[PDB]
Amino acid sequence: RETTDEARALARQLLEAARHASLGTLDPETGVPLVTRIALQTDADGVPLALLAGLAAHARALAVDPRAGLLIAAEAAKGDAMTHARLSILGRAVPAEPDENRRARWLERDPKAKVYLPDFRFWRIEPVSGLLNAGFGQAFKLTASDMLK
Amino acid sequence: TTDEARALARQLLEAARHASLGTLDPETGVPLVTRIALQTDADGVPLALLAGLAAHARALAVDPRAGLLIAAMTHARLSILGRAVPALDLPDFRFWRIEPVSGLLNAGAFKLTASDML
């Protein structure tokens, strides 16, 4: 339960390795969480960075209410899904500036993601809190500092 | 929407073993997204086996609204908006049906009704 530097480093290592995630948004009509799969990396300061189709369901939800959840799992893990390490973030979405360096970092890390680069937009998901599940035993509660550096 | 689209949703539903669960953080209202074991019940309705003490199980006790994602971007997947209601072999774990209101099916999207997925 008690957060250690080891727990902090696993959380940071998951974010550095992340190419995709499950994104939680609030359905405007009903306020029920909409859970969709997204391309997700970090930018320079290690803050989660999403690439969304600007008029898709999850992008429209964000436009109306920027409250956002992320699940980040180890994509390479083998065996039972429930023993994979995974990080839950509670955050707020913010449209991310134009940047030549950003649109390039992203391709070096995800080549496939040329198809997307149009109507496609970067969002920073600024963390408030985090839940680390290491694959076994009890989770760690994380602050925003715990996840970033 | 079409029969092959309804058939794809139930296909993903049938022999799904885990999912991303979306519940509402009670303090902040932010969607909390965690991984869960998920099966269908007798009648094809999503069924989650959830630890009573875990953040998500707490969250559903306060407000039973629940999202599910069942499946990286070329993978067929299914988002479900629904409401949770209570229903190896450790005691504190419990069963929930996530009762579908609507759905979003991504093959390559398609809006779906509760009965399109059952």
Residue numbers in the entry:
A (entry chain A): 7 to 123, 126 to 157
B (entry chain C): 9 to 79, 87 to 102, 123 to 143, 147 to 156
Which of the paper's sentences describe this entry?
Within the opp operon is a gene (pden_1323) annotated by the National Center for Biotechnology Information (NCBI) as a pyridoxamine 5′-phosphate (PMP) oxidase-related FMN-binding protein. Activity assays of Pden_1323 with the hemopeptide substrate microperoxidase-11 (MP-11) show c-type heme degradation to free iron, CO, and a peptide-linked β- and/or δ-biliverdin.
The X-ray crystal structure of Pden_1323 was solved and found to form a dimeric split β-barrel similar to HugZ. However, comparison of the active sites of Pden_1323 and HugZ shows stark differences. While the two residues of HugZ that form salt bridging interactions with the carboxylates of heme, His163 and Arg166, are conserved in the structure of Pden_1323 (His64 and Arg92), the entire N-terminal α/β domain of HugZ is not present in the structure of Pden_1323 (25). Given these structural characteristics, combined with the fact that pden_1323 is found within a gene cluster that is likely involved in the transport of both heme and peptides, it was reasoned that the substrate of Pden_1323 may instead be a c-type hemopeptide. This suggests that Pden_1323 may bind a range of hemopeptide substrates in a way that creates a HugZ-like active site, with the histidine residue provided by the peptide substrate coordinating and activating the heme iron. The structural comparison of HugZ and Pden_1323 suggests that the change in substrate specificity from free heme b to a c-type hemopeptide involves the loss of the C-terminal loop containing the coordinating heme ligand and an opening of the active site to accommodate the larger substrate via loss of the N-terminal α/β domain.
